Symmetry: C4
Subunit: 91 residues, 4 copies
Amino acid sequence: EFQVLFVLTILTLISGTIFYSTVEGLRPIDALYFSVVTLTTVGDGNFSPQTDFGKIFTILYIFIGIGLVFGFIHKLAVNVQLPSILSNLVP
Amino acid sequence: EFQVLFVLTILTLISGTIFYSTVEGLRPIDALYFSVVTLTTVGDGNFSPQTDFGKIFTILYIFIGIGLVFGFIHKLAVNVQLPSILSNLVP
Amino acid sequence: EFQVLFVLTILTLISGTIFYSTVEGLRPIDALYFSVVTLTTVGDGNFSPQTDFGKIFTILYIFIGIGLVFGFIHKLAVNVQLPSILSNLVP
Amino acid sequence: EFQVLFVLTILTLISGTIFYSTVEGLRPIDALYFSVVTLTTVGDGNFSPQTDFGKIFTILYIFIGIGLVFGFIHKLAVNVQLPSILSNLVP
Ligand SMILES: [Cs+]
Ligand code: NA
Ligand code: NA
């Protein structure tokens, strides 16, 4: 479950990294950063796609990727960190 | 369900696209982009409504549209992509 | 329920409107706009508090107000718009 | 529960405050502010990490910290403010 969500999240971010570095001309690290803050809804106060292709892709990217990213964040906290933390709580 | 949420989401975005292009003078694609990043809470680091009418509308738009947009994103991931993905998981 | 959440949300936004217009010197409408986009997590790409008092207040404001605002948005969509929409669905 | 989530949230914010003030050179209050708006997804329309180290850390920080911060916000509203409010509702 967590493994699959992990892989799915990685593939989604790779796609965004490739798209923004190609179409919007961002350095790969910047394309990855933008992809991450966009899908987690944090957003960036500096960059917004400048091309119409970038704007359309971003719209579709958000709708398709938000659900996945938060499902992963969910399991990552309830199925990976909760126990690890809740474990020590045990005297 | 997904069909209705889809239509409802589309109508909400059309309303925002018309409003921002008219009152804030944005190009239609930019008005649609702003509407999408606003209702998904991603936000935009470049544009913020410049008119008081735009500010008031945006406030009301957020409160009324956020619930709908995320309900659609929810079903879109749990009722449309989960199975499609979870399907292959089956050897 | 919805009435109480409505009132509670209104009071929270009034407090933010008063604070930002006073300490950060924003026009009341701008203070209200900032309060709304902050608590809904949309954010603003133009304004960020400039004073340390404003930064500290915003931090506390977010933690205390986010829960309330989304609880209201929740009921507003499930207890006020869902039925109104789901009603017509009935032939 | 709320106590543990409180402590965990505090430690996470301390780590972000130390990181951004050191690597990105922000004043401690600004580093804390950025950490808070990033993990709550509000975001900042003015600052974005300028270093690659800052960008990578932020990506990891978001994925690991978002789950915790919202779990705390959740309990803080349902286990700390709901009753306090719901109490008076009682004639
Ligand atoms: Cs945001
Ligand atoms: Na958000
Ligand atoms: Na934002």
